[PDB]
Amino acid sequence: DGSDPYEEMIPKWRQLNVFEGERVERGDVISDGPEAPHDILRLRGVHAV
Amino acid sequence: AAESSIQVKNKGSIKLSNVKSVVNSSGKLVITSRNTELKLIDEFGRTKESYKVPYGAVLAKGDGEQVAGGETVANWDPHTMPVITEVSGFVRFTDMIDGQTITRQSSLVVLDSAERRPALKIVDAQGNDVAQYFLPGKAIVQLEDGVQISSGDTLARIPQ
């Protein structure tokens, strides 16, 4: 992402929704599932939540 | 609902938004974007239908075409998301081990991460270098080397 990479870890018990780079934008679904409202506002905004 | 067909109630032209146009083996296109949107425009801006389209889907009718309704507009596998080949030509298989990373069902599995995923680009014609191919668990490629597969085509992936 140019600078400050996002080192995230997955326990491998969850599949990865995307394989390629695809220019993933903020809030995009890396892995599928019901998303918590804390992450929605955090990566989307108040109106989104 | 094991049926992957999408029915349309009324004759509204499809409006495919947030999609990526990739040339397939036929006149239809395959979308490589996970997030896709469909809409129905018949007489005004209002959208009659929305539904949803996963990655690796093939649209029966092109965007902006006034579908008569009651017919499928996009078809895709309801069990697997196909992987589109960016380069058309022979499939380049690297580090093919028989007896450990090969499972006879030709249709042969690629590799197993637990048992051990080499990455290679699709050859131009026979073996020319032109793309990274990732093989997750239980991923199988039924296309042998030298198959000369065209762009937009995919074999069964066999999800884990």
From Swiss-Prot, chain A:
Domain of life: Bacteria
Biotech use: Co-administration of salinamide and rifampicin or salinamide and myxopyronin suppresses the emergence of resistance to both antibiotics.
PTM description: Acetylated on several lysine residues in the presence of glucose.
Complexes and interactors: The RNAP catalytic core consists of 2 alpha, 1 beta, 1 beta' and 1 omega subunit. When a sigma factor is associated with the core the holoenzyme is formed, which can initiate transcription. The rRNA transcription and antitermination complex (rrnTAC) consists of RNAP, NusA, NusB, NusE (rpsJ), NusG, SubB, ribosomal protein S4, DNA and precursor rRNA; S4 is more flexible than other subunits.
Family in the record: Belongs to the RNA polymerase beta' chain family.
Physiological role: DNA-dependent RNA polymerase (RNAP) catalyzes the transcription of DNA into RNA using the four ribonucleoside triphosphates as substrates. Resistance to the antibiotics salinamide A, salinamide B, rifampicin, streptolydigin, CBR703, myxopyronin, and lipiarmycin can result from mutations in this protein.
Protein name: DNA-directed RNA polymerase subunit beta'
Gene that encodes the chain: rpoC
Parent sequence residues shown: 1181 to 1229 of 1407
Swiss-Prot record, chain B:
Biotechnology: Co-administration of salinamide and rifampicin or salinamide and myxopyronin suppresses the emergence of resistance to both antibiotics.
Family: Belongs to the RNA polymerase beta' chain family.
Quaternary data: The RNAP catalytic core consists of 2 alpha, 1 beta, 1 beta' and 1 omega subunit. When a sigma factor is associated with the core the holoenzyme is formed, which can initiate transcription. The rRNA transcription and antitermination complex (rrnTAC) consists of RNAP, NusA, NusB, NusE (rpsJ), NusG, SubB, ribosomal protein S4, DNA and precursor rRNA; S4 is more flexible than other subunits.
Span of the entire protein shown here: 945 to 1126 of 1407
Post-translational modification: Acetylated on several lysine residues in the presence of glucose.
The protein's role, per its UniProt record: DNA-dependent RNA polymerase (RNAP) catalyzes the transcription of DNA into RNA using the four ribonucleoside triphosphates as substrates.
Protein name as it appears in the record: DNA-directed RNA polymerase subunit beta'
Modified residues (N6-acetyllysine): K39
